Amino acid sequence: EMQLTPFLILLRKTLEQLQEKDTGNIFSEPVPLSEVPDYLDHIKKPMDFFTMKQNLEAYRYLNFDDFEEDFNLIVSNCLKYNAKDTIFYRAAVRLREQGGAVLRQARRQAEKM
Numbered sequence: 001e002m003q004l005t006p007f008l009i010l011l012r013k014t015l016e017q018l019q020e021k022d023t024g025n026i027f028s029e030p031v032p033l034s035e036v037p038d039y040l041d042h043i044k045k046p047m048d049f050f051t052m053k054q055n056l057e058a059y060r061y062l063n064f065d066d067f068e069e070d071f072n073l074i075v076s077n078c079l080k081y082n083a084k085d086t087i088f089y090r091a092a093v094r095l096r097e098q099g100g101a102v103l104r105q106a107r108r109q110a111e112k113m
């Protein structure tokens, strides 16, 4: 029970804060299938921050869970695909940790709406 425009402004700010935590920009764009040919073998729904931005602007995120679930896919896909001893796996752990605090604060703000 809130107005659409302030909520989308909040999601835009939140997405920018999450992208800031991905300092290597390894999640900024879809995983390039041309360089990872086996990626889709067990990754059923790829996700990335650019796709999240397009979903946001297409009005596909109307509650915080819609938005947070796609963020969680970025993390979980990366933990699934990559071995634990890789920078990519550890980057997803770091993003989960640093991004979780960003998400908790942003969800508090949405609940004031």
Ligand SMILES: Oc1cccc2cnccc12
Pocket: 026, 027, 031, 032, 036, 077, 078, 081, 082, 088
């Ligand atoms: O090759 C990649 C490039 C950027 C991100 C990736 C996330 N998981 C597996 C592979 C990736």
